[PDB]
Structures are given as structure tokens and as C-alpha cells.
Amino acid sequence: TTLTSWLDNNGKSAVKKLKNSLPLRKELDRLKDELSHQLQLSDIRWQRSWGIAHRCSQLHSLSRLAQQNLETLKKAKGCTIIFTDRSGMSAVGHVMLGTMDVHHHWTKLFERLPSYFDLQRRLMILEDQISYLLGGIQVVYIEELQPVLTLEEYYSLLDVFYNRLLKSRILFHPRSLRGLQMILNSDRYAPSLHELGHFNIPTLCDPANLQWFILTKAQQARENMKRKEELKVIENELIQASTKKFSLEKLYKEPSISSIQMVDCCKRLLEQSLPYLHGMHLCISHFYSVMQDGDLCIPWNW
Amino acid sequence: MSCPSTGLTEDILTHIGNVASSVPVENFTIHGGLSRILKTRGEMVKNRTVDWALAEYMAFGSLLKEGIHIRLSGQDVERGTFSHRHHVLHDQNVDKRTCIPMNHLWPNQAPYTVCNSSLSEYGVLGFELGFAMASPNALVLWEAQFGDFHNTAQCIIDQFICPGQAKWVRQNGIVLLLPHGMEGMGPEHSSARPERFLQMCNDDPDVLPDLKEANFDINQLYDCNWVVVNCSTPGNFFHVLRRQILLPFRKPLIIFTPKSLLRHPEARSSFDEMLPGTHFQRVIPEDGPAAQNPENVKRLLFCTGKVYYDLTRERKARDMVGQVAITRIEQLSPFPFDLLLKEVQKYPNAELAWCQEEHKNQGYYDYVKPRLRTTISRAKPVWYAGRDPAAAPATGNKKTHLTELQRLLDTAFDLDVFKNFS
Amino acid sequence: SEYGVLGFELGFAMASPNALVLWEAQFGDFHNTAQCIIDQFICPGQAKWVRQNGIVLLLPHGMEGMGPEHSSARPERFLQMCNDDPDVLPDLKEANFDINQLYDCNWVVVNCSTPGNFFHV
Amino acid sequence: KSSENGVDYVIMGMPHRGRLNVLANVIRKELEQIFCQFDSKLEAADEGSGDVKYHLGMYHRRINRVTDRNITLSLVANPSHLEAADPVVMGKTKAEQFYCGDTEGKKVMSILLHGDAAFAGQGIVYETFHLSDLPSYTTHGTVHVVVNNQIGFTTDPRMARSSPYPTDVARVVNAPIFHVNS
Amino acid sequence: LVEDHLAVQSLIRAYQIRGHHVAQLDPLGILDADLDSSVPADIISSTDKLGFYGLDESDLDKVFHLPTTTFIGGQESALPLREIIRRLEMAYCQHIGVEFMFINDLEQCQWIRQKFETPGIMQFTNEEKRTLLARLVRSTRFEEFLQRKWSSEKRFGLEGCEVLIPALKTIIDKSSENGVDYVIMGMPHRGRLNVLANVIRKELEQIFCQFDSKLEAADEGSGDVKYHLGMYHRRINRVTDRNITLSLVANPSHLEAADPVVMGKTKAEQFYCGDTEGKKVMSILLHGDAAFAGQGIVYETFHLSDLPSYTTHGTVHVVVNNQIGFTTDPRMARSSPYPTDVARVVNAPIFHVNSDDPEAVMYVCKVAAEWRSTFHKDVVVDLVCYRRNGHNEMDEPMFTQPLMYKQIRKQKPVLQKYAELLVSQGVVNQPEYEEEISKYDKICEEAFARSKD
Numbered sequence A: 001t002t003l004t005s006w007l008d009n010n011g012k013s014a015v016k017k018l019k020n021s022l023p024l025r026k027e028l029d030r031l032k033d034e035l036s037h038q039l040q041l042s043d044i045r046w047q048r049s050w051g052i053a054h055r056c057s058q059l060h061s062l063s064r065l066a067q068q069n070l071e072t073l074k075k076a077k078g079c080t081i082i083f084t085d086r087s088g089m090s091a092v093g094h095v096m097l098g099t100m101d102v103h104h105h106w107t108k109l110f111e112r113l114p115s116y117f118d119l120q121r122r123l124m125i126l127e128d129q130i131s132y133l134l135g136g137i138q139v140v141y142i143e144e145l146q147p148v149l150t151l152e153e154y155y156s157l158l159d160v161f162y163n164r165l166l167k168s169r170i171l172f173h174p175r176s177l178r179g180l181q182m183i184l185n186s187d188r189y190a191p192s193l194h195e196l197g198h199f200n201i202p203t204l205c206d207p208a209n210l211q212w213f214i215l216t217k218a219q220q221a222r223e224n225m226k227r228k229e230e231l232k233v234i235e236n237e238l239i240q241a242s243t244k245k246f247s248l249e250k251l252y253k254e255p256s257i258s259s260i261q262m263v264d265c266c267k268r269l270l271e272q273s274l275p276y277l278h279g280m281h282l283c284i285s286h287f288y289s290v291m292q293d294g295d296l297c298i299p300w301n302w
Numbered sequence B: 001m002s003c004p005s006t007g008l009t010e011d012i013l014t015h016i017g018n019v020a021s022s023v024p025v026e027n028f029t030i031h032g033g034l035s036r037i038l039k040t041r042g043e044m045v046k047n048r049t050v051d052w053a054l055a056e057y058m059a060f061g062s063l064l065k066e067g068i069h070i071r072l073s074g075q076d077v078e079r080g081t082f083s084h085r086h087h088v089l090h091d092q093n094v095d096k097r098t099c100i101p102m103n104h105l106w107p108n109q110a111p112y113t114v115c116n117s118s119l120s121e122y123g124v125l126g127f128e129l130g131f132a133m134a135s136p137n138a139l140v141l142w143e144a145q146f147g148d149f150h151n152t153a154q155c156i157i158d159q160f161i162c163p164g165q166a167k168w169v170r171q172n173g174i175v176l177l178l179p180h181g182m183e184g185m186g187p188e189h190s191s192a193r194p195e196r197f198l199q200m201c202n203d204d205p206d207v208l209p210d211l212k213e214a215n216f217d218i219n220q221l222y223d224c225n226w227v228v229v230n231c232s233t234p235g236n237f238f239h240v241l242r243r244q245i246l247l248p249f250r251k252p253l254i255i256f257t258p259k260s261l262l263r264h265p266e267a268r269s270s271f272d273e274m275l276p277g278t279h280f281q282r283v284i285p286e287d288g289p290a291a292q293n294p295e296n297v298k299r300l301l302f303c304t305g306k307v308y309y310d311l312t313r314e315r316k317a318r319d320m321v322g323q324v325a326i327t328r329i330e331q332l333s334p335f336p337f338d339l340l341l342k343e344v345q346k347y348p349n350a351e352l353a354w355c356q357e358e359h360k361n362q363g364y365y366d367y368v369k370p371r372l373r374t375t376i377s378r379a380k381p382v383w384y385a386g387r388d389p390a391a392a393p394a395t396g397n398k399k400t401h402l403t404e405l406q407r408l409l410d411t412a413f414d415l416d417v418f419k420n421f422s
Numbered sequence C: 001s002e003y004g005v006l007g008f009e010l011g012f013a014m015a016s017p018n019a020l021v022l023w024e025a026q027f028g029d030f031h032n033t034a035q036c037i038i039d040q041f042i043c044p045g046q047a048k049w050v051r052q053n054g055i056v057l058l059l060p061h062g063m064e065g066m067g068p069e070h071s072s073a074r075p076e077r078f079l080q081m082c083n084d085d086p087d088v089l090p091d092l093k094e095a096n097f098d099i100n101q102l103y104d105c106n107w108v109v110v111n112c113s114t115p116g117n118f119f120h121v
Numbered sequence D: 001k002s003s004e005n006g007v008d009y010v011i012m013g014m015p016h017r018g019r020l021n022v023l024a025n026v027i028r029k030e031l032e033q034i035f036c037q038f039d040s041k042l043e044a045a046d047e048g049s050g051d052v053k054y055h056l057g058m059y060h061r062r063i064n065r066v067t068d069r070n071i072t073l074s075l076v077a078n079p080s081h082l083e084a085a086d087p088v089v090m091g092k093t094k095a096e097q098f099y100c101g102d103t104e105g106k107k108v109m110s111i112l113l114h115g116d117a118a119f120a121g122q123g124i125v126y127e128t129f130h131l132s133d134l135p136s137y138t139t140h141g142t143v144h145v146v147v148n149n150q151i152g153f154t155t156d157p158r159m160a161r162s163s164p165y166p167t168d169v170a171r172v173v174n175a176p177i178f179h180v181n182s
Numbered sequence E: 001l002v003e004d005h006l007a008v009q010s011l012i013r014a015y016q017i018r019g020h021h022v023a024q025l026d027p028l029g030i031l032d033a034d035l036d037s038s039v040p041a042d043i044i045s046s047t048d049k050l051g052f053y054g055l056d057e058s059d060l061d062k063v064f065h066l067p068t069t070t071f072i073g074g075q076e077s078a079l080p081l082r083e084i085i086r087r088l089e090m091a092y093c094q095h096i097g098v099e100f101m102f103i104n105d106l107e108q109c110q111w112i113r114q115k116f117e118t119p120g121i122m123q124f125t126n127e128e129k130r131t132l133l134a135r136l137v138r139s140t141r142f143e144e145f146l147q148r149k150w151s152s153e154k155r156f157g158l159e160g161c162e163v164l165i166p167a168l169k170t171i172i173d174k175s176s177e178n179g180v181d182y183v184i185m186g187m188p189h190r191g192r193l194n195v196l197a198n199v200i201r202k203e204l205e206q207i208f209c210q211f212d213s214k215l216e217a218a219d220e221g222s223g224d225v226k227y228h229l230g231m232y233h234r235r236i237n238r239v240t241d242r243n244i245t246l247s248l249v250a251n252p253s254h255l256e257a258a259d260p261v262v263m264g265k266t267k268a269e270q271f272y273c274g275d276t277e278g279k280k281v282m283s284i285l286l287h288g289d290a291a292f293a294g295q296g297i298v299y300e301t302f303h304l305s306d307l308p309s310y311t312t313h314g315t316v317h318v319v320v321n322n323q324i325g326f327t328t329d330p331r332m333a334r335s336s337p338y339p340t341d342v343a344r345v346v347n348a349p350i351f352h353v354n355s356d357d358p359e360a361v362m363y364v365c366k367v368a369a370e371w372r373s374t375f376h377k378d379v380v381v382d383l384v385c386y387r388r389n390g391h392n393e394m395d396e397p398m399f400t401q402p403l404m405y406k407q408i409r410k411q412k413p414v415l416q417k418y419a420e421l422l423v424s425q426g427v428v429n430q431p432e433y434e435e436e437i438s439k440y441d442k443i444c445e446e447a448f449a450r451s452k453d
């Protein structure tokens, strides 16, 4: 158990860093809820780590933009905003302001919202067509499993797949209605069955090979869609119990962490007690580190 | 596109001035000479006046208030080459203990970084340029010990900063501060070579921007490769750094900072140029007894920077106030056509001269002259008053440099050297 | 390397006037890496120091659409470092104008278009 | 291996030799976009003068095959001048480490590619290696890859350096060197 | 003892490969020049660390047989480990630190080991001490006089490193002994006037004339400052029976930019004299610690040093390591233990010497001059010293470096302590030391009247 030594060495700097970092957290909350109220946005989110100091600067810049141009910015009622590395609208309708763009680039984006909204209806109609084609099959855009896709690129993928596949050969059956989803993978190798329960299927694929692949593993997919949810529920209860035991402000995970890994992580914490974990922020990651704003990174491997 | 005013309310300025003058740690001991500098800073702050060192605090603190990271890097920048800023204080008794007064201005403020670099211009400038292209919410400044040592990094300037936006889409707003001015110093301590930067500009002298355009400037700045400026007052230096950030876009900025004006008694400005509703001034008009009776003035001299305070002293010594009108030019980059056209109209009958510190084949002449000739319909030949051409930036003999300055001031106020020719 | 080799050649050229030392650049665009040597030693060396240097620099130049860094050796930068005075017309009517004019100048630039002129220079 | 060790963001700089191959496979740029550049009738929409294909940058994020974790890649546009983009890559890495609140650069990494003749004859290599360790300039580690093909343009390697190997500047900062027969 | 001798073998490794990490090179006492205060487990400073090698206190008297990679034994072929450690500590952990184990030629390593490890080799005659005393007196009194006559000017004087002048004179004298007839030098701002007055005997009267405010240049040229001018002078060496020509190249303020120019001039002189291995022409370069470790052109020059058609067959580099830049701490100036680590990329040995002991500086300079003639390679000599005043004579050092200069104010100049050491040994007497200071002051004053005339 080297985490004991690591904690004993690095806890004091962590508590000092937290004590320094509280005011920036207060300021971030104030800026976020003020901006959310003013523009009537549904939510504001971030896609990368980034520290409380850079997030505050991004919120300040957006506030300045709203101060200068208010009428054009007002076109985003009910639209949630995410901060990314590229601009444009996402595959499921998020304004993705990009960290490396000046206000002149954002203002252009906020003046093109109606056309993007129009394109969204066409994409939804395409979704419905593909759904009725293979029998009821939801086509989903699962982020953190696909590259960041702008609306036009996803529409082009859907269009090329539907056009190049329907014209040549076709097979129909209204089964698979309740479950089974398609990632629509962008042509990596070949169709495959992901562990969660969905399918990442390349575009322009062979309809015969696609049919043979799909027809045979329905039951395993249906079994996976229930395994995933019941592990998620046991995770909710374990992560509540750990916070109760050690009195953490919040305990969370990196997006890349598998749920089973968090099973094992929480289970092999709950049988041990450590002094310095009291009243701190802890996150599950891949390395031993302390963040500049006062968070601890404990790898899921002791 | 438009730019908000860069002024600030008075209480912010007073708080910033009080913080910089005061030392946050009572236990910390400050060198007696440094303590006198801190006391003089308070002297000025209570009287509502700023020198050159205080304007830099009042720009950096005002930017740090609204979550803008600031990184000042260079060669001996924590104290200053001419020992004028003292951004970092050292305890005389306890070793390794340090205070930065600008990190204590407000409880919720953005990070500030001052670092002394290794002895290198070609790696450090590249490092800073790479740092400046990772986010538009930071102000990265590179300081040169003297403006003459920048050519060691010429490659970076020629290949990355100059054409970077035309060759690749990325926008970058790095600021370069280069001390400049001829003061009887060694040739390699005189002239940062502004004529080399001014010729890389993609502006066309023959082409004239339409007078009837919005602001005209938010469009002159936009239709330009980078902005160059030669500030002569601390108020303008305060306004430029704020305009760099409040603009909708980013472009590189080249400021030619002074050397002997850091202690010049009349090179300071009031708080009234920093209050809300004030703007950066590209051309500073002629204000004085001459503007009251324009027809009486027989000559109009255009200058830039440190020369101004030399010409004004000569004009009074000769009883020529009201006979000569001196005008400063502050930007030079996207040349200001509209304002300068009005100045010629203001004095119907006055020959136009360009007065200059450097030699004829260096400095700002031969960039400025075609542009000044473009604004008028060649109504008046633009004359020249300054030093003769030479191969080296400045002379190594102190005696000749004084004589040269004297003959420069002699030809500026003669009123008949070119008058007989015209 | 352009910054060490050019300095080496310049030092070689100031040890005797009975030698011809030529420095060749692969493209005229890579000379700015040696800007320091050009700005402080070659350009004002006889104005600041008694020693006189007779080095020759050959820089390929010409826009063939090969790209920004394979086009223009930047002659406008060399032509402005000249000490000549633009606003004065010399006395054209004097013997040896060509040599008198050549005797008081920091250096000479040329852009030859025929091999005969390149032979004569 | 870096993605295994927790890295999530990689920044790269590279010279002319082999640029297109890296863009096609390592950066996973679309093949059609590469083939489109070679077309002559090509026009540029931007008012930019534009640059040649071997001087353009590329940014892309994708799921790694070996590691389910997403990884983000970036290639920095550089001029024809060799080694002049090393400090630019270092500065960008430092900025990314700073903004992500990274105190020892564990989640951001830098990789640089060099040629043998340029790596042993340019001065800026020395300055960059010296910057590598100073506080407020250190990025906590870099992996340099040198392609020693034993020739410059037409210059024998014997008249290009005064040291047994092109990679001897690395000995001034105590960095181990592994030569391998490719 | 079945394999205990093995440890002793490894023991010697440590010193010859690491002793310089624990040498006393700093003159002040505080500040380790190697930026490392840690002591290597290899070196034995306390007896406890014998346990690192599997040895106890009883092993000190046992008698060990030395190998051929050591010359400490001298006549003896065997020694007690007591005396072995004593000899090795004197050889590498004192006022001289030698960095030479990265070269892969055995004959070059044996030469260095013989030069530095044999007992009693560094012995100086009373006449040599007398000459050194005279040169030190001159070097000090010149700067004293410059202070007394021109307090406001920025002299850039060598207070803190006054042993540079005797070092250069010793190098030139040994080279003249080895057949050199023409020396070319390049040098930065620090200490230029002292060298112009005491090494290349430029007429003192012109040195004083340059300081005159009422000076005109009758030449048709811009001109340059007093620290950028070239001087050529041929003088008979006193110690040698042969003459020597000394040339100093005019340089700009850009730092280290005149190194390739000096190399090129040396190559041209070697070529014209029909010299095939540069045996009668030599080059010497002076550097500062902050510039030598931060400029790129140093790397390129060192690489040019060996290529055929560019090699000049050997250079002697002298670095003045005063542990400060302009106002920059040496910790934020480089990423290597010493400023002189570029020299390791071309396999050139390095000798660091504490400049507070002149009699080791003389020996190191002599050894470097012999090495250049024997092997025709580069060699670097590092003089660890301090800076007494600020960068200029008008800078304020206390604002940025308060604790270092507090120690500087309480330390004696080298000339004093050398004078008392000589008087104690009986080599000289106080009446003789006063006479020379008075003689040098008459020569300086007469010249000042001539400058006024």
C-alpha cells in the first residue's frame, strides 16, 4: 500500500491548496449562474479538465461578449453551451464555443443558429428513415466514444450510409425495436459488438456482411444492456457509501475509467481507513498526483 | 466592429496605486534607496499623477481584475534594465524570501508571472510566441534589454510573427517591448531599427482608405499585419495595452519604449486621461498658444516620441511659441490618414517639416514621407530636419553627437532654410 | 550553419587583400539566420573600425512560385542599409564619377542578368 | 505507451522528411483531403497567401485502439527553416500544461522529430536544450527522435560535425541516448 | 581480502570521476559553483561511508598495491589506504577540479593523470613568486588608479578576478617556449582596459587620452566606444629569448559573436605562413559564464573546431566564472552543473581552479598551454571568482542579491593575502612590497600629465 506513504507525504500541500482555491470556486459559481440566468441558457458545460482559473477566464470572456452584442447572443434561449477546442454545433445540438477563437469568430456562430436548427430537422428525418429501414433501430451519437463531430459531418455520414446502402441491396424486419443501437463508426475496420451493448458499424459496409453480423448476436446485446445498468446502480450505492465513510466533499471519476474498475476501486477502499482523506476532493485516475487547485488523483491500481 | 472605451473609474486607480507604493509585509525590510522610490511613488499617487512605472501597474492590475492571465518575460525584467519597476522585492536579512506586490491587489484575480530568462533572444522569443498561441485570454509580453539585440531572433520575427496569419489561419497577439532612443550611448545602445519593422507592413502608400468608413481604425487595424507604436506619454501606454485585449480580434503589437523618459520630470500625465470615456490617441494634436491663432503659425513640425521634449525646450528659448506648431504621431502602423489631413487644413499657410532623431536613412523618414505626401494633393513639399545619413546606427564619439543635435535644432527653427527654395 | 560559417569567412577575408573569399547561400532566404554578422561586422565595419573587408556574398533570388521561403532573398533589406543620400543629385559632370561614387559607400549590390556582366564584376 | 501511462494530449513538431506519411497514419488525416492538395486547379478561399502542403498543421482527437481512453493529437505548422519550431512546440506544451492545472506535466507530452545534419549544426538546438530544465520554462520531459540516415543534402557526414554521433548535445544535460538499427 | 581490493579499485573511480563535485572552488565560502551541495556516496568524506564499500575502520592501515591508472604512489608501488585517500583528496578535492574522464583515448588520460596526481610536481621557484607578485601589484593598482581619476564612468573593471593577467601572461610565455610566434585574441567587455594596458603593452598615454571628454576623431568614420577597438603589437618576451606578435580583434557588444571571426583570422594566418598543423599560430578566447552557456553560436563554433578545411589545430578557452550574469542568479541561467559543459560534446578536458589561490592558477595555465602543443586539441580553463562591484560602477548590487555581497564586503583581496603569505615564507619583505606599489604609482601619474598636455 504505497498510497499511505503518498498521502502522508502530500496531504499538507493539498489542504493548503484547497484553502487557497475556495474564493475562485465561489467566483466560478457566481459567474456561471449569472450567465445562465441572463441568456436563459439551459446549461453550461466543459469538455476538458482545465482548472478553476481558466474556467473563470472563459466565463469572463463570454460575459464580455454578452455585454457587447446582446441581441445576437439572445438567439440561444434554451440551448446549452459546451466549451471545446473547435466551434460549430455538435451532433446533438450544442453550441461548441472553442477555446482558441476570438469574439469575432463566436459572433459569426451566434448569427447562424436558425440554419443549423433547420439542418437538425433534416438529420432527424434521416434518423427516422434509417430506423424504419432496418426495423426500429435508434441511431445515437455517444460522445466520449466518437471523435468530436460537427453537425455537417454527421449529416454527411448518415446521408452517405443511407444512400449507398439502400440503393443496392436491402433486408427488412420490424424486430430489434425495443433495444439495439448503432454508433455508425466512421470506417475504422469492420462491424463489431462493443461491450456496453451497442454496435459500432462502419459506413459503406457490405449489406450482406452487415446482415449476417447483426442477425446472430441479438441476445448477447440484450444481456449487456441490463448488465451495464445494474453495475451502474451498484456504483451509485458504493460511491455514496464511500463518501459517507470518509467524509469527502465529492468523489468522482475520469471519463476513461470503466465502471468495473470503479467497482474494484470503491470495494478495496471500503475495507481500509486513511487519515488525510477527510474533507477533500478525490478523483479516480491513472496516476499519483495532486492538482494545482487542491484535488487528489488516486489511480485505481494500488 | 467597435472597441469599448478603455478608461477606468478613479477608485480602482487609487487602490492600485496605494497597493504598488505600499509593501504588503511589515516584517520585510526594503533597501533605503528602494524605500525612497516607494515613497516617491506614493508622492505621485496622492497628487493624481502617474510616471511610466505606475502606468504599467495600472494596466496590469486592471487586466488581472477580469481574469486575464499576464506573463511578462524577458532579460532582467523583475527589476528593470534601467532599474525603474521593481516588480519583485528581496529581504535584506532572510535568504530566498520574496514579495510580489501585484499578487495582492484583489482576492479573486488571475495569475501573474514574471520570470528572468536565460541569456538568449532566439529561444526565449520562440517560447513566448508558442505560449501566446494557446489561448486568446492571456497577455504575453517579451522584453528586450536593448532594442538592438532583437536581430539575433530575426528568423522568428520574419517567419512566424510577420506572415503567420496570411500563411496559416491562426491569430496571435504577442506584444514586444523594445527600448529605443539616441542618447549619446554606444551605437548598439541607440536605435532599435524601426525602419526594418515599418517596411514589413503590407500597407500601400498609393492606396488611400475611404474617409467615409466606420471608425476607419477598427478597419485600419483589421486590414493590417501587425500594429507598431511609439508612445511618448504614460497615458497612451496605459491605453494601448488595454485596447490590445478589449478588441474583438488579436494582432501583434510592437511598442518602442523610451529610455531617458523614465525619469524625465515633465513626462507624466494626470488621472484625467484614464477616466471612463477616454480613448487611445493615434495623433496627439497641437494644444497651446499656436492653436488659438492658426493663421499666425508659419511652420508645422511633425515629430515622434523623445524628440518632442527637445524641440519644445528649443522653441521657448527662441521666443517662437505661436510661430511654430509641433504635432506628435503615436501609431504609424496603419498610418492615420484622417486625423493628419485635418492638421494641414488647420494651418492653411505653413510649410510641412518632419523632424527626426536618427539618421536620414534610418528611423521613420522614407516610410512617413510617401504617406504624408498621399494625404495632401502634393500641395506642399514635405521637408526634412534631422541627422545626415550614415552607415552605423550612431556615432561612438560623444563630442560629435552633441554638435549633431545642435545643428539639428538649428535647422528646425531657422524658418528660411527651405523657405527660400520654395 | 549560416551564422558560424559566414563569420569564419569574414574573418578569413580580413587577413589579406590578395584573396577572393566567396560565401554561397543555398537559397537567399536562409541568410537572416546570420543577420547579426551582416548588421554589425560587414555593414558598418569600416565606419567604426579602420580595417576594410572585401568579401563577396552570392544569394540566389527569384520568384518561381516555389513557395514563400524559396522566392525572394529580400533585396529591400540590403538596399536600405546603404549610406547613400536620396534627396541630392551629385555633380554628374566630373571625371571618374563611377569610381569616386564607389569610393565612399559601405558596400555594393548588383543583380546581374547576363554571364558577361557576372564575369566583369 | 504514453496513453497507457495517463497522457491525454500530445503535441508534435516535425521536419519536411516524411510529413505526408505521418499525417495519413499517425495524425489519421483523411486520405481524400491529402489527395485534394496535389490537384493543380486548386484555389484557396482564404485571403491568406497560403503555404505548401508540407508546412500546414493538423489537429485531431480519436479513441486509441490499445487504450479505450480518448487521446488528442496536434501537429504544429512550421516553415522550411529546420529546427526553428522547437521552442514554439515547447511553449505550446507549457501553456497547455498551465491551463489544465498540471503541476508536473503528467497529462501533456511533447514529441520532436529531427534530421541528423540539422540536429548537429544549428545553434537553436543548444538553446532549447538549456531551456528544458529552468523553472518557469520546464515542461517536465520531452522525447526526441532523430532520423540518422547518414547524409545531409549532398554532404558527407564526415564534414558535418566534430563529434562521433549527431546526438551529442544531449550529453550536456545528462539525457540517455539509445541508438537502434532501424 | 578475497574481493575487498575490488572496492579500492572502485574507490579510485569515484575520485577521478567525481572528486570535482566536492572540491573547494568557490572563493566566498557560500555558493557551490556546481549548483550541487549534495556529497556523492562514492566519495569518502567521513569514515562511516567506508561501509558503502564494505570496509570498516580497521582497513585503513592495511597495505594495498596500486594500478597503472594511478601515479599518486610516485616511487612507491604500495601504500596504506590511509595515505591513498590522503593523496587522492589532495589530487582532486582541493583548489583544482579536473573533468577529463569522458575522453576515450588512453594516452590522453595517462598524460593528465601524470600531470595532476604525481607528488610535488606543482613546485614554484622564489623568482616565479616574485614575478607573480609584481604582476598582481600592477593589475590591482591600475584599477585603483582608474577609480581615483574617473569615479563616474562605467570602467567594467576586474575587481574580484585580478589573477587573469598573470594567467594570460603565463599561457603566452609557455606557448612562446613551445615555438609559437603569433597569437590572436578575442575578449568581451569585462576587463578589456586592464589587458590593453598590461598584456598587449598599448601605450598607457593613449589609454588615458581616450577618457578625455574634449576628443575629436579626425578620421571620416562614425567610430566606436573604448571597449571596441583593435590593437597589434610585437614585443620581446622577457622570460623567453624570442619575440611574439599579439593581436586583439575589435568586436561589437553582441556577446560571443566574434568567436568565428577569430577562428577565421587564425586559419588565414596559418595558411599564409605555410603552416600545416598550426604550430606557429595560436588562438585564445575569453568568455563570461552567463554568455558561454546561453548563446547558440558557441555550439556552432565548437563544431567547426575539428572539420577539415576549418580546423585551426587547437584553441585555449578561458572562462571567467564569477557566478552572476547581469542581475540573474546562475540557477536560472543554465540546465547543467557547470557553464563549461558544451566542451564535453567534442571531448575537451576541463580544469576548474579556485582563483583565490594564484599558485594553482599558474600551474593550470601552464598545463593547458602544454596540452595544446602536445595534442593539438581544444582545452578549457575555468576561473571561479566573484564580482566585487556591480555590473557597472553605478549599478546597485544589493537590490537583487542582498546576502552574497554581504559576504563579499567582508573578504580580503587576493593581493593582500598573497603578500602576507610571501612575507611569512621569507621570499620577500614588507619594505620590498611597498617599493613596488610606489613605483607603479609614479609611472601612472607621469602618464596622466602627458594625457592632459
Ligand SMILES: CC1=C(CCOP(=O)(O)OP(=O)(O)O)SCN1Cc1cnc(C)nc1N
Binding pocket: B075, B119, B145, B149, B152, E190, E253, E254, E255, E287, E288, E289, E290, E291, E292, E320, E322, E324, E325, E326
Ligand atoms: C545581459 C548582458 C550581459 C550579461 C553578461 O554576463 P556574463 O557573461 O556573466 O558577464 P559578466 O562577467 O557579468 O560581465 S552583459 C551585456 N548584456 C546584454 C546582451 C545580451 N545579449 C547579447 C547577445 N548581447 C548583449 N550585449
Ligand SMILES: Cc1ncc(C[n+]2csc(CCOP(=O)(O)OP(=O)(O)O)c2C)c(N)n1
Binding pocket: C026, C030, D017, D080, D081, D082, D114, D115, D116, D117, D118, D119, D147, D149, D151, D152, D153
Ligand atoms: C535553415 C535551413 N537551411 C537550409 C535548408 C535546406 N535543406 C533542406 S533539407 C536539408 C538537409 C538537412 O539534412 P538532414 O536533416 O539530415 O535531412 P534528411 O536526411 O532528413 O533529408 C537542407 C540543408 C533548410 N531546409 N533549412
Ligand SMILES: [Ca+2]
Binding pocket: E021, E022, E032, E034, E035, E036, E037, E038
Ligand atoms: Ca558540490
Ligand SMILES: [Mg+2]
Binding pocket: D115, D116, D117, D147, D148, D149, D150, D151, D152
Ligand atoms: Mg539526414
Ligand SMILES: [Mg+2]
Binding pocket: E288, E289, E290, E320, E321, E322, E323, E324, E325
Ligand atoms: Mg559572469
